[PDB]
Structure formats: structure tokens, C-alpha cells
């Protein structure tokens, strides 16, 4: 028959031409594309289609996927498009129209017994965040991390000591050994990194044996051009990644003397702006170069009234936080001169806030900025794909770990979250780990029904002993899974490798590989690229804030 | 109305019927308090209680169980013994007997 | 007292109404959660007080009004629903479209 | 010498001839007998019995039990007696008299140094709980029911899915042993059931290969004849059960040609009644067969003046919510012609109200239709073994575990709930799961005794790690203990399999075998048996309602 | 250069000569030694001291430290020092200076790329306590007594039994078994207590070659002088301790005939004052006996007005709680006649006040009595020695256990606890077990630091899975490690064996080897050292109460 | 604040008297959970002034009367008991029969 795009979009979620808001931001994404044919969409309920020789098929288990999720709105850095998800064996099987083949056209999807439904219709799925600037401080972190939507934490530490208050490193090889075996309790995808701050290879390279996917060079622990080279060379050796927080207090050097050590190598520069650290007042310039993968912690993100207050009590303190630079930086993260978003968590950062704080930039520069260069059409869609990218596949390209998860593409471990339109970034429906709901908002639980209140978050069966060791990946060095670590630690979950930490570059970066041609002034701190100055003026009211938080 | 009230019906319960019974006058001879309990070997009790240890051999105090009879010092009783049943095995107390008896 | 978990569950919901309550009282539109919190303790007191369901059902479209909450949170929530033990057991009240 | 019988019950708890009120109810229950020697009751204390050469004997640990209940009050299907029960290696050993043999009479019950006591006197101790129609939409389901005395758990799920919130189904292979990973984890015994929806049979034995103890026929998958047949079949050849959940709109036939479908091959019927779902407005005349065991979901017990407005709207709907079907249920339910009560938890269901709810069935129906034909004496007796049935023994008969748990009787897996007259079924003292304590009423950690406030229920060591693997079972179909599950998904807790689901019928079901000629009008939906019309009045106020809970 | 004594004790803590007042009291300790060298203290942070190639050297892993407490005022029965404290394979490896010995002078601990570090500056470390009165009535006691400062707990229950709730035993190997799964999953050193009361020498056997590393005589289980014998006569070929709680009623004899029944045997006396339990109303004359090793329980600790009252109801109850026995154990414990304090955990004592209760005991002390005989210099560094000895080194030596843990000396578990001075035995900074933190108070998750509000204690790293389990210990009998119970039982913590509880006598207890002639009077309770009354007086108020506690 | 175990569950304790106190209020014959959280609270309330444990143990029963709770309430209550800091420390307070 016929049926009106209203009562449609009511009953299946919107299709191509139709405009969603995100939250209550200014962005606004376009289905740019359907890939279900009309009539043929599948419904689960009492009377609907997904029903044996039906919906669902006659299929063995091998033959049909473990779970679907129909008339998804995904939104992820290669496109804003209507599908159905299937996920079999807990990785991404297939994006496209789910069903049985015997009655239906054009299935891609195949349901049968042996698959289990989640109704997506009306929502937005989007991969799992991932953290890349993790202090362990303490394990509670990684529910909040997880309800925000983060899935992967990459970082180090050893619990509430000075070391790890500071600096996101797990000092030698008993520590990582016993963070391994800690992290089989955590929920989300774990990788640490380690001290890189030493003068002797071989401290470095036992550090890499025991497990670690990456070396931390802190200035807390010497920032120094011989310790950078030095963890830069096993680095090269290893394929694992560099993380570095420079010296502020140019002791060693300055900007320019820190990227001469670095030599044109791969490394991953935190807190690029320099509030949260790095030499003053132009750590800011390396995004200017093709071996720098630049992010931002979330604090100053985006550019606020009460920023600078909060900052400098939070906190020569002068020279560090700059009003110069905390504009800037939505500015080049609105240009793509800025790939990643991480948070730096209880050490000048907020763990349950950096996908929120991500979508605050991009609504910010909206207002300020109006469209991008590249944008099509009346919506933020290109905007919309910049952004996710930056805390999504641009830290697990950084990081080597892309081969497992980052995006929704098939092969990739099942890390899904799925969002209400209306609390889009801030508080998810229903989050999924390696194909298991992991945690999800829950209510009254001796009710008729999931719903009656108190609704709030809770742990479900894929955040459960056994279940869990199977939903999660612990990520080992070549080096480490080569030698055995897994089995002689006795670690219970799933273990991935990274590799390709060395290749990557800043042309590398999805949608975000700009690489400007940027100056800071040594005495006013004012940031230019190409001579025009880049600033921004701070918000004095924000979306996703006031209107969803109870405190 | 009470909630799990009992309507317990009115009489009185017999206790260790159809066994030996005797009664024994007993005395505190000793200038600290001693309490006694229903199941304990009579003639095993605290040396300061003076009787005729011999008669109360195999027997406890005939009271309901888990019950006990104090005996301030200087203080003297008659006390009425119930004969132990079972396998008339006694082990333990002061290691008097250790066997049958 | 012997508290079961869906009873110390249910003091969750009283304090955070109770945040709410203190709110309205200084002349502030309430935010999402703030609302769904008062207006849930109100029926929980209805139910203890002895109201039928029906009777709740109505009384909770009262709570708040569409000026007393900020832009957009009536549209935030369509419905509110919670359990509270009536004179006859537990039940279930849904007030649908509370706040206008 | 001599006590007075009330001095005696203060003591000891009450003997025969004795009554206790069942929490607030009108429900008394008598005292039948007594297997104590008076005088000879064994007591726990300073200056008690249960002493070195007293109560407690010489005996070396394999000829004495690990844990004695001293003067429990026992209500059971097969009688309220007064008498010590004893437990070894995780069951019950024996129901007699507890003691040494050494200096006391007619010991059946050995007490020695390797014995642990626990004072029942007093208080009344029966089987744990058993519901079969659990909805796993989150695991915080198993801790509450736990509380309200429920130990064993049947049902399927996957967390809070849509499949999950409608039915009862644990899909497929992957689920199937993610789920059974998981139940490692809760102090509960459990079982799953798979999804039974298919007219492929090996798409069903896979399933059961994998370990689901049953199938789930539901409407949402499609229930239509042909599903039904192939799912029985295989049940046939499995020796697992069926549950079912008809097509309430009568779809594929009415309720005559489900009944036909099933063609006398055994089948345990969800919520029969009608409004938790099933052919309208008829599937309530299944009672009246041979092969169909009958069980009741509980929101609609009893009924109650709010029950309609209740349901209507946590709902055509008016053919599915009736009133005449709602207030015969509770009258079938006192005749013997429904036999097991369960909860449908959180979808249509109360997971923390199965006992609570059955209790007020039957202290409704004393007060509306006085003593049952059974009774003999001036107390409830028979109706109290009639309703504690339903959530003890026959679920344990309808889903082949009862050679495990169920009931009080020696062998059996020691799944104990003591109860304070007072309280009975709302709020329970202790909770016992294989012979260590799971969970219980605790006060402040902190105090100098357990009973300062706040008092709340709190995991006692039962339900830790490795002693609750201990402690709990893990049911498996025959086909999945024998192709070695447990060892292939590394499964921690004691496993046990399930037989005998074919045989059952309704004559097995313990005090509720009765198979009425019951109708029900397709215009006035008025149920008669034998013509007679059965009908009820809803209630205004019930007992362990407003006098027990906060909220 | 020069620098002023206060700028230097704010910046890295006070030296020799500065006095510290302890937490509210009256009780101040003064710095008797430093073992740096002024001017190479290491400080870690920005442009600090432990930075590569300053103080941190180029060391493997190997030649140096895991961990290293920087400037801790080490408050232990041996002295009260400032030094570094470097923690190496879960274990104390040195007491020192700490640093790089490529450019600093006088290091003995070594500072690597493989070091984590924790600031102690301005800090006070202790060794975490030793609490032996445990009644196993709930798990939850554990995360009360870790947060309180206990470490290791020995004691005996299976849950909230009536035996548990009355003695401190685990009756039979499989309760004891049950409950060695279950310690794996406590974040406490464990060792278990069996039932000792029987006659027949196999029933204790069994239950020690299961695991236990006692055996308690209590006289609710029948405290004869056959008993006694018994349970010695197997504690002295086996290797482990006897704990008593006496025949309070006097039925089988008085003090003297349990004395003699116990034959100048080692055993360790529990709440030796009497209100606890024992012999009324002398049981506290056992203190004067080179074979007897006494100790408190914890709620007649110290003296206070509201004492009587309460026990009085807590609770011939006038022969048991006596007004002068309470107040002369405050004086003997001041005296060292009494070496152990404990709680008696939920059956008359506080689990979490074991520390806070014997600090309050000196304080009152002190002010009563002045200063100790001992005491060189003012302060109260000696009276702080005796009291603190009374719950770590004491009751290790006491329970054969000193080998591992008790004390902060070279090659015992690294169990650590630090205090900031105004909190003091009340509520500690960090505490970490084996190496690493377990419990610790942390703010906010979300918040950028992890000091804002609300500030409680919550569980770290070290209390997780597989890291609990290498940070923790679970001591056995010599017979049960040889008998394999570790790999039979499949327990995953380290395993530690007493040995030494026989050899054990009054004159080992530090600082508490008094043995006064004391004498108690039938009539009037007065206790008597040497024909002078012991006696004093009650508070009316104590530190360490009001100002610290919410509630 | 630092707050320990035992003091975050006390908290439980006096957020169920706020619940008991406020339906009081309104006119309410108190439930059983309803009279033990608020006589608890009284009597922590009460040590936190100062007062004695003997002077609590009497003030205790004087708090609800059994004109103020339901039916069989007084009965399922033989006693009252809870610890709160003391000037001189923890004590344990036991009202007995506290509603008559
Ligand atoms: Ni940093
Ligand atoms: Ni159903
Ligand atoms: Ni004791």
C-alpha cells in the first residue's frame, strides 16, 4: 500500500531526507542513505514480522547471525545511513537488510532461531568510544567510562599513588603484570602503557615484554631529548606507540628542540594545546607536522566562561594557562589540525565526559563558525563525521589496535552503543560489549516492567565474571603475546596484538589531517596560521549539560 | 490481630518419662558462684560442690533442657537427678569415666 | 527493617526527589531527571496514602506544569511510571504526558 | 519434671496440637506432629545442651552432619512437623532427632565437633522457591529473588533486548553458553530455556545440544502449529520440557487447534489464565487436560480492586484483560486445577513476589470460601500443603529437577528458607543455598552484635566466589552433560541434568491434579465448571502488603 | 644551602627533634632518627627530584624497586623513624635512602624505570593490623576492618549461624573448606579457626589437616578441663594455636582447676579481663602466667561512663560485668601485663575499632598515669611502642604468622598503612596489601582531581580479581600444605604455613611481658598487683570520636 | 569527609526515618520498617547531642505510641537497637518494648 513518511518514520525511525537533532545541540544529521526495501522491514512483537517461516528463517546456527539490530540510524566516520546490523561470533557481521531469504528480498542479514533482537528503530548506533589518556587511579572509572559510551581504555597506572596521580604510566614489569590481571575485572577493552622515561633501552624493552602497548614519556619523570629518543627507538623496534606529555618548563629545551629529538618519528602528543602540559606557551605547533598524532584532554574543551577560573585554581601558572590558546583549539579541532578528543582522567580531565564534551566543540563552532568547507547539503553530516572520528577510529589508528575496534565495519569486534536521539552523548540506551549488553539504564527490578523508576545505570550479564573475560580484548605488545605473558599471568579474557603503531600519520587521521601552518607569539600567546589570527569567544550556557544532569 | 501469633493450647508437658530419677542434697563450698547445666555430667561438676558423688554417677540434673541451677557460695539444694540414656558412654567433663557408665 | 533491595532502591528515588523538591521551592524550572524524580515520589506517597490507581493516574498529569521545567523536557518525557506497595499489594501507575 | 505448654513453645517453639498464624493472614497452621523426646531437645548456648560429651559427641566428621536446625518447624507438601534436620555435604541427611548417642535417646541426627549450628526454634523452615518463567533482562533479578526465598531459577534471556523483555528465550548456541558462563556468577540455581520457535528441528536440537533444559514456545517468534509440533517432537526425543505462551490472536487457529497441535504430548502452559498472554478468551480450558501442567504468572494473583486498571494499561486489549478469567483463576488455584504459580519477571511479572503473592491466594480464598473438602481439623493444613506446592515441588516436577531440589526430603540438594512466624513468606530470617547461607537480614558491620540498625539483606559467604560455585547447580539437558559443556565453556558451579519432563501430567502434580470440566463463554467470557459459574470478589486491602514494606 | 626547620618539615615532612601529635590525643611521638641526607631527599613531580637521570637511574627492573614510599615517618614497635621504604616482589626490601646512585650518595634503594611511587612526606606508615577475635558472621566485615587499618584477620564462622554468632569457630573440613574458597575473595590475610571442644584427639586432627591454624575452646561448646587437654595435646604436635574463652558459670571448676587442666601449655587467652567471657570473676589472673598470652576484646576498651550500661544490657550478668575488672585492664594493658588487642567482631566488639579503641586506651592512660617508667625524653614514643605492638607484632608471634606479616622489617608482606596526622588510628590515606593499594579514600570519579567531594572509601586495584589474589594470603596448617589442600580445593591466593605457636611465651610479646602477681577478691571484684589496688577512672569524653564520625 | 563503611550505611538509616517522618506527619499509623528507622534515628540523633545511653534506652520509648502505628506493629518491635558515636565512642543502645 501507501503509508506517510510521518506514521513511517513513527513506526521503522527516519529514512533518507529526514533530519534528526542531536540531543539539544544545533546539529542536525541527514539520512544519507536506506538500504532497506519498503514493505520488507523487520518488526519484532506480538503479530510482527520477526516470527518463524516469517521474518525468521529455518536456518542452522552457523548460518544465520547471533544478534540483530533492526532499522538502525548509524552514524560513524564513513557514513549516516539506515541499516540493519548483524553480529555473529561477537564481531560485526554484516550492515544491511536482515531476514529470512525464503519470503523476503534482498536479504543480507539471515535471522533465524538462533538469533536474538534488539529493536533500534527511532535510535542511533555508533561505535565505542576509546580513551586513550587514562590515569588508573582507581577501577571505578571504568563503569563511568563505560555508561558514557566508551568501550576501550588505553592509559596506565597503579591505583591512587603519586605516580599514577600524575602520569598515565604502570612502572615495570611487576606492576603491568599485576594491572593485567586486575584489568580481567574491568568491563571495557584494556591496553597499558608503561614508564618510557629512562636513558637504557633495555628498561624499556622489559617494560614492552611484560605487556605493555605503548611508553608514556612524562615530564614528571624527565621529559628529556635523551629519554625521548631513547623511547622512540625501542618504539621502532617494538611497533608500539609513544605517548608524550613534553617539558613545560623548557629545562631541556624548547618546542623545537623536544621535535628535534623526536626526529620526524611517529608519536602521539597529549594535551596539544598545553594547559594540560607541554612546553610553554608553543607545544600548540606540533600539530603542524606529519609524524604528530595531536589530541586534546577534555577540560578545556570547549572554550566556557568559568574555564580559566577553574583552571588556573586547578593548576608560571600564568605561562601554562592561556585564554590565547583554549580558543584556538576548538578552532583547529573544528579544521581537523586536532584528531583525537581523550580525557586525562582524574588528572586534569573527566572520564565520563569526553564523548559529551566532543559534541559541545562541534555544536560551539557551529554557532560561531556556520558551515564547514566540505559540508553537502542543508545538515552537519561532514561535521558530525569529523567529530565521532576523534574518539572513535582516530585513538585506535593511533594506538594499533584499528584491526579490532573503532568503527562499525565487518570483522570488528561487536562495541556498539545505541542512543535515544534525545540523549544522544549523554546518556545511552543500551551499551554493548563484543556482542553482549554490558550495561544499560535499568529500572525498578521486582516491577512488572524495565521501566518504572528509579531508572539507573546497571551492570548486565556481558559485565559478569565468565561472560565478561569473553566480551572484553586485553591488549598485549607483539613482543609480550609472543612470549607467553597471556598464559603465564593466567589472564581470562580475550587477548589482541596491536601492530602498525609506527606507520601511522597525520595523513592518516579520518577526516581530521590538517596540518596547518600554525606560530603562537612568544610574548602575547596569540595562535596564527598562515598570518590570520585563530580564536573563539567562550559559551556562557552549553548543550547536553543542565538540562540531563540531576547535580 | 498479631502477625505469626502462636495459640499454644493450654497444659503441661511430662519431661525424661519413664527414666531412673534422684534426689541429692548438694552444697557450695566454695567462695565463687557455680552454674550447672541440664545435660552435664553430675558427678563431674565443680570439686567445690559437696555430695555424694558416687550416687549421682551417670545421671544429670532432671530440668528442662538447656536450662541450668545456680549455687551462690555457702549455698545448699536438693537437686533431682535423671539418669543418661543412649549408649551410658560418657567422654569428656573432667575425664572421670571416659567410657561406658 | 529488614530492607529488601527494591525497598533501598526505592529510598534512591525519595532522595533524589527530595534534591528536586528543594529546587522547585527556589523557583527553578526543573531539569529531566528532577522532574521524572518528583513526580514519581509523589505517586509512591499516593500509593501509601491510599489512592487507587486510577485515582494517580490522573492526580500525577498535576505535579508540574510545561512553566515550571525547562525547554523541552515535557516532550523528554512522554510517559512516567513506578510501583509502590497500595493497601492491595504492589501495582503499577503510568501517568502518560504529565507535564503540560 | 514438668513445664507448662507455654513456657515450653517460648523455649523450644511450638509442638503438637500448637497453631501459628502465617505472618498477617487468617491462615493457621497446626502442629501434626512432633519427633522430639521431651526433655531431650537439643539447645544451643552457654550452658546449653550441644556441648563436648553432652549434646555433641565423639564422633569423627564422616559420621556426624556439618550443620544441624535445631527445633525447625517444617512445612512441607508432606506435613508440618517439628524436628531437627540435618545436613551433610551440601543435602539433607536426615528430619529426626538431633543429638549424641551417647547419653541420649532415640538420636537419628549425630552432633559433633565438625557440626555448625543453626537455632531454629521458633521459626518455621521450608524448600526454597522454584520459578520457571524468568525473563533474564538484567542479573540484579537473581539477588531479589534470592531474598524473597527463591533459590532455583528457570528461563531464558540475554539482558535487556527486545527478544528478552517478550519472551522467555535464550537464542542459540552463542547466547546459550554466554548465559550459562554467566550463571557462575549468581547465588541462584539455574536453568534456560532456548528458543523453540522453528519448524527445522535440528535448529532446536542444536540448542538443546548446547544446554537449554527446555524450549520456549512464543507467540512473538510464532507460535503456530507447526512450531509447536516440531518443538515437541524434539522435546520427545531430548527429554526436555516445553513451555508454552499461544498465539493470543488466534491467528493460526483457536484454542482447539493449539490443543490439537500438541496432540496429548506433554507441555507446561504460562500464565493459563489469559491476560499474561494466550489464545483469547479460552486458553484458560488447557486445565482441563491430562498433559498440560498449568501454571499462573503473578500480577494477576490475587485479584484485586486495582488489578483491570492496572493491567489495561501495562497492556483487543480489552479481549485479553478480562475480569472473569482474572477472578476464577484464584478459585482454580484453590481447587487444585492450576498447579504452579511463577512470577514473568519484569515483563508482566514480579520476580520478588511469587511466595508473597501465592500466600494471598490462599488467605483470599479462606476468607471467601472457607475450609477446603480436604481439611480435616480446625486449621488450614491441607491449603497450606496445596499452595506451597505450587512453588516448590511441582515446578521442580514440570522441569525434571525435582531428583535435586523442590522439597524438604533426604538426598535433595539443601535449598533452605527459615522464616519468623511473623514475617512468613515476605521477609525471610535466613536463606540457605547447598548447606552454607547465601544471603540474610544483617545489621551494622560495625556493631557489637548483628541485629543493630539499619538491618537490609546483605551476600552472606554462600554467594562468594568459589564457595557459591559450591554451593549452586547448573542444570543441563542430558545431550549437552554428555558432549562435555560444562568442560568445554569451563563451567565452575556443580552441574545436574534433567530428566523425566516427558512423563509428567497433570495427576503428578502434588494437592493440584484436577482436571475440571471447565468452559468459558466467547461472548461474556464467563468461566463455568460443570455449568457452575466460578466467579470471585476483588480485594480492597490484603495481608504482607502496607505492614511490611518502606515503599 | 640553609634552609629553616618548618619550611623543611612542610616540604618534605618533620626530622629529628620535631614532635607530632597523634590524631585528637594527648600522645606525641618525636622523630628519633632520618636516615637521609639533607639536601638528596627525593620529591616526585614537575621539575623534581625522581626524574631520569637525576634521581632515577638506568637500571633493569631487576636492581631495583616496584615501589617506594618517599619520606614516611615509620611509627613500629623498633622506632619511630623517617626513611624511604622501598617494596619489592610484594615484600619489604629496604629501609633507607632512596634514589640514584649515579649521582646521589648514601642510596640503599634504588630507583629504575621500574618504580612506582607513593608521596609519604608529611605522612606517618605503620604496618597494617592483626585482629585474631574474628566470628565470620558476614563477609562485609572485612572491607570494615581493611578500611580501619586490619590487614590480616584470624578467627572462625561459616555465616550468620548461631555457632558464629557465639565463638570464633568453623566446625569440620567441609565448612573449613568452604570457607578457604571462600577467603580467596576477601581482601584480607586470612587464617581459620576450628571447633576444639571434643574429647576425642581424630575430630580435632581432621579439622586441622583441612586448614585450620587453630583450634577455639569455647564454653559454648563445652570449655572442660578434658577438652582443653585434648585440644592442646593436638596443638602441640601439630603446630598451632589454642584460643580460650573459659567456663564462665565455674560448672566443671574454677580458674585454678582450667590453669591446671592447661598444664603450663602455650594458649592464647581471649578477652583475659572477663566481661567477654571466663571464669567469673578472676579469669583475668591468668595474666600472671609465663605460658598464657592475653589479650581485650574491644568494647570494654577503654573505661568510659556509658561502658556499664551498655554491657550490662549487651548481655550472674553482675558477676560477669564488673566495674572493677574494667578498669583495672586499662591500667595492666598500660603496664604490659595484657600484649593483645582485638575485637570479637558482632558477638561483644567492633570490628572496625580494634586500632581507634587502643589509642584511645593510651591516651587515657597517659593522662591518668603520666608517663611510663620507660619513657627517655619528652614524648611518648615508648607508651606509643608498647600500645601499637598490642595489634601487629603481638598477635603474629601469638598465631605463629610473624614470619610473614606483623611488622615493617625486611622481607615480610609489604602490608602498609598510611596516615595523615590528624587522622591517626581513625581513618587512613591509603592502605595497601602485598604490594599493592586495596582500599582508599577517592572522590569523585568524574571530577579532573581525585580529591572533590564526596570523599569514601572505595575498594582499588589490589582488592581486584586475580590481583587480590597475588596480594593476599591465606595461612594453613603445616599438615594442610603438605596434604595439598591449596591444589584440592583449587585456591588461588598465596599460601603461607604457621609455625612457632608452641614455642610462643609471655616474655616474647613485645613490650608487654609483664607477669604481675595478681590477685582479684571473690567479694568485691578489687583486683590487687602486689597487695596495691589497680583501678581507674571513667571518661566522660575520648578522642578520636566526635570529631571524625558523621553518624 | 572520608567516609567509611559504617557511616554511609547509617545514612541509609536516617534517610528511612525522613520517609517515616514525613508520612507521620501527614496523619499516618506507621508500618513496621516506617517505626524502626525513625525511633533509630532519634536515638543517633541523640547520642550525637550527648546524651547518656541509660538516658536514651527511656527517652526511646516514648517516640511512637501504639495509637501512632498499625495494627500487630508494637508486637513484631520487642526492641530496638543501634550504635551512633558517643562523646566517649561507639555504644550500643537497646530500647525494649519501645511502643506501647
Ligand atoms: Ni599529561
Ligand atoms: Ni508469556
Ligand atoms: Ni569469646
Known amino acids: ?551 | 490481630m498479631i502477625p505469626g501469633e502462636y495459640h499454644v493450647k493450654p497444659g503441661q508437658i511430662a519431661l525424661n518419662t519413664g527414666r531412673a530419677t534422684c534426689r541429692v542434697v548438694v552444697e557450695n563450698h566454695g567462695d565463687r558462684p557455680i552454674q550447672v547445666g541440664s545435660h552435664y555430667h553430675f558427678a563431674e561438676v565443680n570439686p567445690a560442690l559437696k555430695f555424694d558423688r558416687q550416687q549421682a554417677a551417670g545421671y544429670r540434673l532432671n530440668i528442662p533442657a538447656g536450662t541450668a541451677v545456680r549455687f551462690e557460695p555457702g549455698q545448699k539444694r536438693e537437686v533431682e537427678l535423671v539418669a543418661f540414656a543412649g549408649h551410658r558412654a560418657v567422654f569428656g567433663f573432667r575425664g572421670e569415666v571416659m567410657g561406658p557408665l | 527493617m529488614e530492607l529488601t533491595p527494591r525497598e533501598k532502591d526505592k529510598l534512591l528515588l525519595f532522595t533524589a526527589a527530595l534534591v528536586a523538591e528543594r529546587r522547585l521551592a527556589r523557583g527553578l524550572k526543573l531539569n529531566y531527571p528532577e522532574s521524572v524524580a518528583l513526580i514519581s515520589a509523589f505517586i509512591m506517597e499516593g500509593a501509601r496514602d491510599g489512592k487507587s490507581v486510577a485515582s494517580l493516574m490522573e492526580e500525577g498529569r498535576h505535579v508540574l506544569t510545561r512553566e515550571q521545567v525547562m525547554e523541552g523536557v515535557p516532550e523528554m518525557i512522554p510517559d512516567i511510571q513506578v510501583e509502590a506497595t497500595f493497601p492491595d499489594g504492589s501495582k503499577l501507575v503510568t501517568v502518560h504526558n504529565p507535564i503540560i
Open chain 1, 1 to 551: 500500500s501507501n503509508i506517510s513518511r510521518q506514521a513511517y518514520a513513527d513506526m521503522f525511525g527516519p529514512t533518507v531526507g529526514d533530519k534528526v537533532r542531536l540531543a539539544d545541540t544545533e546539529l542536525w544529521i541527514e539520512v544519507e542513505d536506506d538500504l532497506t526495501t519498503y514493505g520488507e522491514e523487520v518488526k519484532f512483537g506480538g503479530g510482527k514480522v520477526i516470527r518463524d517461516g516469517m521474518g525468521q528463517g529455518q536456518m542452522l546456527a552457523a548460518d544465520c547471525v547471533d544478534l540483530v539490530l533492526t532499522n538502525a540510524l548509524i552514524v560513524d566516520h564513513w557514513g549516516i545511513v539506515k541499516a540493519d546490523i548483524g553480529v555473529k561470533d561477537g564481531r560485526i557481521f554484516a550492515i544491511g537488510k536482515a531476514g529470512n531469504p525464503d519470503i523476503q528480498p534482498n536479504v543480507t542479514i539471515p535471522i533465524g532461531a538462533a538469533t536474538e533482537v534488539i529493536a533500534a528503530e527511532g535510535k542511533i548506533v555508533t561505535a565505542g568510544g576509546i580513551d586513550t589518556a587514562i590515569h588508573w587511579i582507581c577501577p571505578q572509572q571504568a563503569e563511568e567510562a563505560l555508561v558514557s559510551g566508551v568501550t576501550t581504555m588505553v592509559g596506565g597506572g597503579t591505583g591512587p599513588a603519586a605516580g599514577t596521580h600524575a602520569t598515565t604510566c604502570t612502572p615495570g614489569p611487576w606492576y603491568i603484570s599485576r594491572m593485567l590481571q586486575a584489568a580481567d575485572s574491568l568491563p571495557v577493552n584494556i591496553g597499558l602503557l608503561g614508564k618510557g622515561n629512562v636513558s637504557q633501552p633495555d628498561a624499556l624493552r622489559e617494560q614492552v615484554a611484560a605487556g605493555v602497548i605503548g611508553l608514556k614519556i612524562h615530564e614528571d619523570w624527565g621529559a628529556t631529548p635523551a629519554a625521548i629518543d631513547c623511547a622512540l627507538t625501542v618504539a621502532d623496534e617494538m611497533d608500539i606507540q609513544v605517548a608524550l606529555h613534553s617539558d613545560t618548563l623548557n629545562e631541556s629545551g624548547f618546542v623545537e628542540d623536544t621535535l628535534a629529538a623526536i626526529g620526524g618519528r611517529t608519536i602521539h602528543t597529549f594535551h596539544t594545546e598545553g594547559a594540560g602540559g607541554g612546553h610553554a606557551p608553543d607545544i600548540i605547533t606540533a600539530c603542524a607536522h606529519p609524524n604528530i598524532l595531536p589530541s586534546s584532554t577534555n577540560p578545556t574543551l570547549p572554550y566556557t566562561l568559568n574555564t580559566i577560573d577553574e583552571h588556573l585554581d586547578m593548576l608560571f601558572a600564568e605561562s601554562r594557562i592561556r585564554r590565547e590558546t583554549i580558543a584556538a583549539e576548538d578552532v583547529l579541532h573544528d579544521l581537523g589540525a586536532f584528531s583525537l578528543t581523550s580525557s586525562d582522567s582524574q588528572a586534569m580531565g573527566r572520564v565520563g565526559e569526553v564523548i559529551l564534551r566532543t559534541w559541545q566543540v562541534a555544536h560551539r563552532m557551529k554557532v560561531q563558525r556556520g558551515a564547514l568547507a566540505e559540508e553537502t547539503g542543508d545538515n552537519d553530516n561532514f561535521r558530525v563525521k569529523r567529530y565521532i572520528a576523534k574518539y572513535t577510529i582516530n585513538p585506535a589508528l593511533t594506538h594499533g589496535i584499528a584491526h579490532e575496534v573503532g568503527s562499525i565495519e565487518v570483522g570488528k569486534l561487536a562495541d556498539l552503543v545505541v542512543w535515544s536521539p534525545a540523549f544522544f552523548g549523554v546518556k545511552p540506551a543500551t551499551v554493548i560489549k563484543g556482542g553482549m549488553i554490558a550495561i544499560a539504564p535499568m529500572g525498578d527490578i521486582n516491577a512488572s516492567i524495565p521501566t518504572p523508576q528509579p531508572v539507573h545505570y546497571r551492570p548486565m550479564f556481558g559485565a559478569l565474571g565468565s561472560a565478561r573475560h569473553h566480551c572484553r580484548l586485553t591488549f598485549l605488545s607483539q613482543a609480550a603475546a609472543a612470549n607467553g605473558v597471556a598464559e603465564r599471568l593466567n589472564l581470562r579474557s580475550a587477548i589482541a596484538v596491536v601492530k602498525g603503531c609506527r606507520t601511522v600519520q597525520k595523513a592518516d587521521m579520518v577526516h581530521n589531517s590538517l596540518q596547518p601552518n600554525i606560530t603562537v607569539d612568544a610574548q602575547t600567546y596569540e595562535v596564527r596560521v598562515d598570518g590570520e589570527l585563530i580564536t573563539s569567544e567562550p559559551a556562557d550556557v552549553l548543550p547536553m549539560a543542565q538540562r540531563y544532569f540531576l547535580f
